Protein backbone atom coordinates (compact mmCIF):
# COMPACT_ATOMS: atom_id res chain seq x y z
CA UNK A 1 0.00 0.00 0.00
CA UNK A 2 2.78 2.40 0.95
CA UNK A 3 4.60 1.72 -2.32
CA UNK A 4 1.34 2.44 -4.21
CA UNK A 5 0.94 5.82 -2.51
CA UNK A 6 4.63 6.71 -3.18
CA UNK A 7 4.08 5.81 -6.88
CA UNK A 8 0.88 7.91 -6.91
CA UNK A 9 2.72 10.91 -5.36
CA UNK A 10 5.69 10.54 -7.74
CA UNK A 11 3.27 10.64 -10.72
CA UNK A 12 1.43 13.64 -9.35
CA UNK A 13 4.74 15.54 -8.79
CA UNK A 14 5.80 14.74 -12.41
CA UNK A 15 2.40 15.69 -13.78
CA UNK A 16 2.77 19.15 -12.06
CA UNK A 17 6.24 19.52 -13.59
CA UNK A 18 5.10 18.41 -17.07
CA UNK A 19 1.80 20.26 -17.45
CA UNK A 20 1.82 24.02 -16.82
CA UNK A 21 -1.97 24.28 -16.89
CA UNK A 22 -3.49 21.79 -14.33
CA UNK A 23 -7.14 20.98 -13.80
CA UNK A 24 -7.04 22.88 -10.44
CA UNK A 25 -5.70 26.10 -12.16
CA UNK A 26 -8.19 25.64 -15.05
CA UNK A 27 -11.34 25.24 -12.90
CA UNK A 28 -10.28 28.37 -10.95
CA UNK A 29 -10.30 30.30 -14.27
CA UNK A 30 -13.50 28.70 -15.52
CA UNK A 31 -15.42 29.47 -12.36
CA UNK A 32 -13.72 32.89 -11.96
CA UNK A 33 -12.01 32.22 -8.60
CA UNK A 34 -8.63 33.57 -9.62
CA UNK A 35 -7.00 37.05 -9.29
CA UNK A 36 -5.14 37.73 -12.63
CA UNK A 37 -6.78 37.03 -16.09
CA UNK A 38 -9.73 37.17 -17.08
CA UNK A 39 -9.66 35.13 -20.29
CA UNK A 40 -10.76 36.85 -23.47
CA UNK A 41 -14.05 35.40 -24.61
CA UNK A 42 -14.42 34.40 -28.24
CA UNK A 43 -18.15 33.97 -28.98
CA UNK A 44 -18.52 35.24 -32.57
CA UNK A 45 -16.51 36.44 -35.58
CA UNK A 46 -16.20 39.96 -34.24
CA UNK A 47 -14.73 38.79 -30.86
CA UNK A 48 -12.49 36.31 -32.78
CA UNK A 49 -11.00 39.24 -34.73
CA UNK A 50 -10.56 41.29 -31.52
CA UNK A 51 -8.99 38.37 -29.57
CA UNK A 52 -6.65 37.26 -32.43
CA UNK A 53 -3.73 38.63 -30.38
CA UNK A 54 -4.14 35.58 -28.14
CA UNK A 55 -2.26 33.96 -29.67
CA UNK A 56 -7.13 31.82 -44.69
CA UNK A 57 -10.81 31.32 -43.81
CA UNK A 58 -11.78 31.27 -40.14
CA UNK A 59 -12.53 27.52 -39.68
CA UNK A 60 -9.04 26.91 -41.06
CA UNK A 61 -7.10 29.36 -38.88
CA UNK A 62 -8.83 27.91 -35.90
CA UNK A 63 -8.16 24.30 -36.95
CA UNK A 64 -4.49 25.28 -37.48
CA UNK A 65 -4.18 26.95 -34.07
CA UNK A 66 -5.33 23.63 -32.57
CA UNK A 67 -2.50 21.75 -34.30
CA UNK A 68 0.10 23.86 -32.60
CA UNK A 69 -1.53 23.44 -29.18
CA UNK A 70 -1.83 19.67 -29.89
CA UNK A 71 1.90 19.72 -30.80
CA UNK A 72 2.80 21.41 -27.48
CA UNK A 73 0.58 18.81 -25.62
CA UNK A 74 2.37 15.93 -27.32
CA UNK A 75 5.64 17.31 -26.02
CA UNK A 76 4.34 17.75 -22.46
CA UNK A 77 2.81 14.19 -22.47
CA UNK A 78 6.14 12.79 -23.79
CA UNK A 79 7.96 14.47 -20.89
CA UNK A 80 5.39 13.06 -18.51
CA UNK A 81 5.62 9.45 -19.92
CA UNK A 82 9.43 9.52 -19.39
CA UNK A 83 8.83 10.03 -15.65
CA UNK A 84 6.74 6.89 -15.32
CA UNK A 85 8.94 4.23 -13.59
CA UNK A 86 10.10 1.60 -16.07
CA UNK A 87 9.12 3.54 -19.16
CA UNK A 88 12.53 4.80 -20.39
CA UNK A 89 13.98 1.26 -19.97
CA UNK A 90 11.37 -0.12 -22.45
CA UNK A 91 12.56 -0.88 -26.02
CA UNK A 92 12.69 2.58 -27.61
CA UNK A 93 10.45 1.50 -30.56
CA UNK A 94 7.77 0.45 -28.02
CA UNK A 95 7.99 3.87 -26.33
CA UNK A 96 7.41 5.54 -29.67
CA UNK A 97 4.47 3.17 -30.39
CA UNK A 98 2.86 3.80 -26.93
CA UNK A 99 3.00 7.57 -27.45
CA UNK A 100 1.89 7.36 -31.04
CA UNK A 101 -1.30 5.45 -30.21
CA UNK A 102 -1.85 6.92 -26.79
CA UNK A 103 -1.27 10.66 -27.02
CA UNK A 104 -4.72 11.55 -28.41
CA UNK A 105 -6.60 9.72 -25.64
CA UNK A 106 -4.48 11.71 -23.19
CA UNK A 107 -5.07 15.00 -25.06
CA UNK A 108 -8.88 14.43 -24.95
CA UNK A 109 -8.69 13.48 -21.31
CA UNK A 110 -6.81 16.63 -20.34
CA UNK A 111 -8.90 18.82 -22.65
CA UNK A 112 -11.93 17.96 -20.44
CA UNK A 113 -10.06 19.71 -17.60
CA UNK A 114 -10.24 22.97 -19.68
CA UNK A 115 -13.97 22.58 -20.69
CA UNK A 116 -17.36 23.20 -19.18
CA UNK A 117 -20.74 22.77 -20.92
CA UNK A 118 -20.36 26.34 -22.50
CA UNK A 119 -16.85 26.34 -23.98
CA UNK A 120 -13.10 25.63 -23.73
CA UNK A 121 -10.06 27.47 -22.31
CA UNK A 122 -7.43 28.12 -24.91
CA UNK A 123 -3.91 29.79 -25.09
CA UNK A 124 -2.79 28.50 -21.74
CA UNK A 125 -5.97 29.92 -20.12
CA UNK A 126 -5.80 33.35 -21.89
CA UNK A 127 -8.85 32.74 -24.03
CA UNK A 128 -12.14 30.97 -23.76
CA UNK A 129 -13.91 29.79 -26.95
CA UNK A 130 -17.64 29.16 -26.67
CA UNK A 131 -19.11 25.83 -27.60
CA UNK A 132 -21.76 27.64 -29.70
CA UNK A 133 -19.18 29.53 -31.67
CA UNK A 134 -17.32 26.31 -32.47
CA UNK A 135 -20.49 24.47 -33.61
CA UNK A 136 -21.36 27.44 -35.95
CA UNK A 137 -18.23 26.82 -38.06
CA UNK A 138 -18.90 25.44 -41.55
CA UNK A 139 -19.16 21.69 -42.13
CA UNK A 140 -17.22 19.58 -41.42
CA UNK A 141 -15.41 21.96 -38.99
CA UNK A 142 -18.48 22.53 -36.81
CA UNK A 143 -18.32 18.84 -35.73
CA UNK A 144 -14.76 18.34 -34.57
CA UNK A 145 -15.23 19.60 -31.04
CA UNK A 146 -18.87 18.68 -30.10
CA UNK A 147 -18.17 14.99 -29.33
CA UNK A 148 -15.23 16.19 -27.14
CA UNK A 149 -17.65 18.54 -25.26
CA UNK A 150 -20.09 15.60 -24.86
CA UNK A 151 -17.30 13.35 -23.49
CA UNK A 152 -15.99 16.13 -21.20
CA UNK A 153 -19.27 16.99 -19.52
CA UNK A 154 -19.86 13.36 -18.54
CA UNK A 155 -16.16 12.86 -17.65
CA UNK A 156 -16.08 16.03 -15.50
CA UNK A 157 -19.16 14.81 -13.53
CA UNK A 158 -16.78 12.17 -12.09
CA UNK A 159 -15.01 15.00 -10.31
CA UNK A 160 -11.40 13.76 -10.63
CA UNK A 161 -8.62 15.94 -9.38
CA UNK A 162 -5.05 16.27 -10.75
CA UNK A 163 -3.81 13.50 -8.41
CA UNK A 164 -6.35 11.06 -9.87
CA UNK A 165 -5.71 12.19 -13.47
CA UNK A 166 -1.91 11.65 -13.12
CA UNK A 167 -2.35 7.93 -12.54
CA UNK A 168 -5.24 7.57 -15.02
CA UNK A 169 -3.08 9.08 -17.77
CA UNK A 170 -0.17 6.84 -16.97
CA UNK A 171 -2.44 3.71 -17.13
CA UNK A 172 -3.55 4.76 -20.56
CA UNK A 173 -0.08 5.34 -21.89
CA UNK A 174 1.08 1.85 -20.62
CA UNK A 175 -1.48 0.05 -22.90
CA UNK A 176 -0.09 -3.35 -23.89
CA UNK A 177 -2.60 -3.74 -26.78
CA UNK A 178 -1.25 -0.98 -29.12
CA UNK A 179 -0.46 -2.27 -32.58
CA UNK A 180 3.14 -3.40 -33.41
CA UNK A 181 4.39 -3.53 -29.78
CA UNK A 182 7.53 -5.72 -29.68
CA UNK A 183 7.57 -6.68 -25.95
CA UNK A 184 4.05 -6.55 -24.34
CA UNK A 185 4.76 -8.27 -21.09
CA UNK A 186 6.97 -5.56 -19.44
CA UNK A 187 4.40 -2.92 -20.46
CA UNK A 188 1.46 -4.81 -18.94
CA UNK A 189 3.54 -5.44 -15.80
CA UNK A 190 3.99 -1.67 -15.36
CA UNK A 191 0.34 -1.03 -16.21
CA UNK A 192 -0.76 -3.71 -13.62
CA UNK A 193 1.07 -1.71 -10.93
CA UNK A 194 -0.34 1.66 -12.15
CA UNK A 195 -3.89 0.08 -12.07
CA UNK A 196 -3.45 -1.04 -8.49
CA UNK A 197 -2.16 2.49 -7.59
CA UNK A 198 -5.19 4.01 -9.38
CA UNK A 199 -7.58 1.71 -7.54
CA UNK A 200 -6.17 2.65 -4.13
CA UNK A 201 -6.05 6.38 -5.08
CA UNK A 202 -9.79 6.30 -5.94
CA UNK A 203 -10.68 4.33 -2.76
CA UNK A 204 -8.87 6.84 -0.48
CA UNK A 205 -9.51 10.06 -2.40
CA UNK A 206 -13.20 9.29 -3.38
CA UNK A 207 -14.35 7.03 -0.58
CA UNK A 208 -18.02 7.63 -1.18
CA UNK A 209 -17.90 7.26 -4.98
CA UNK A 210 -19.06 3.74 -5.55
CA UNK A 211 -17.55 1.88 -8.52
CA UNK A 212 -15.48 4.99 -9.54
CA UNK A 213 -12.64 2.66 -10.67
CA UNK A 214 -15.00 0.62 -12.91
CA UNK A 215 -16.33 3.89 -14.35
CA UNK A 216 -12.79 5.09 -15.30
CA UNK A 217 -11.98 1.81 -16.96
CA UNK A 218 -15.07 2.37 -19.09
CA UNK A 219 -13.93 5.98 -19.92
CA UNK A 220 -10.71 4.39 -21.36
CA UNK A 221 -12.95 2.48 -23.76
CA UNK A 222 -14.92 5.56 -24.55
CA UNK A 223 -11.64 7.44 -25.30
CA UNK A 224 -10.75 4.95 -27.94
CA UNK A 225 -14.07 5.53 -29.73
CA UNK A 226 -13.55 9.27 -29.54
CA UNK A 227 -10.17 9.02 -31.12
CA UNK A 228 -11.48 6.64 -33.85
CA UNK A 229 -14.26 9.12 -34.64
CA UNK A 230 -11.75 12.04 -34.72
CA UNK A 231 -9.45 10.17 -37.13
CA UNK A 232 -12.46 9.58 -39.41
CA UNK A 233 -13.20 13.31 -39.45
CA UNK A 234 -9.57 14.08 -40.28
CA UNK A 235 -9.76 11.59 -43.13
CA UNK A 236 -12.77 13.50 -44.62
CA UNK A 237 -10.68 16.71 -44.34
CA UNK A 238 -7.69 15.24 -46.29
CA UNK A 239 -10.36 14.35 -48.97
CA UNK A 240 -11.43 18.02 -49.47
CA UNK A 241 -10.13 21.21 -47.82
CA UNK A 242 -7.41 21.87 -50.43
CA UNK A 243 -4.58 23.85 -48.77
CA UNK A 244 -4.52 22.05 -45.38
CA UNK A 245 -1.42 20.29 -44.09
CA UNK A 246 -0.52 18.73 -40.69
CA UNK A 247 2.40 19.75 -38.55
CA UNK A 248 5.17 17.13 -39.12
CA UNK A 249 4.76 15.80 -35.55
CA UNK A 250 1.00 15.18 -36.24
CA UNK A 251 1.81 13.59 -39.62
CA UNK A 252 4.00 11.13 -37.74
CA UNK A 253 1.35 10.37 -35.20
CA UNK A 254 -1.36 10.02 -37.86
CA UNK A 255 0.75 7.93 -40.24
CA UNK A 256 -1.40 4.74 -40.62
CA UNK A 257 -3.54 5.24 -37.32
Amino acid sequence: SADLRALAKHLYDSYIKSFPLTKAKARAILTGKTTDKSPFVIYDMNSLMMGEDKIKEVAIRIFQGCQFRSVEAVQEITEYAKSIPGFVNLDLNDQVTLLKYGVHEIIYTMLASLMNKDGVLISEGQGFMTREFLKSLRKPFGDFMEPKFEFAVKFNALELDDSDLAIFIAVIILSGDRPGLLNVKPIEDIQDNLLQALELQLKLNHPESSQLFAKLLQKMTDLRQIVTEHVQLLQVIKKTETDMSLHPLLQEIYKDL
Binding site: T78, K82, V96, L249
Partner: peptide, 10 residues
Protein backbone atom coordinates in the same frame (compact mmCIF):
# COMPACT_ATOMS: atom_id res chain seq x y z
CA UNK B 1 13.67 10.17 -38.81
CA UNK B 2 11.06 9.78 -36.04
CA UNK B 3 10.31 13.00 -34.18
CA UNK B 4 8.83 11.11 -31.15
CA UNK B 5 12.01 9.13 -30.94
CA UNK B 6 14.12 12.29 -30.69
CA UNK B 7 11.78 13.77 -28.08
CA UNK B 8 12.07 10.59 -25.99
CA UNK B 9 15.89 10.69 -25.75
CA UNK B 10 16.17 14.40 -24.62
Amino acid sequence: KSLLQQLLTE
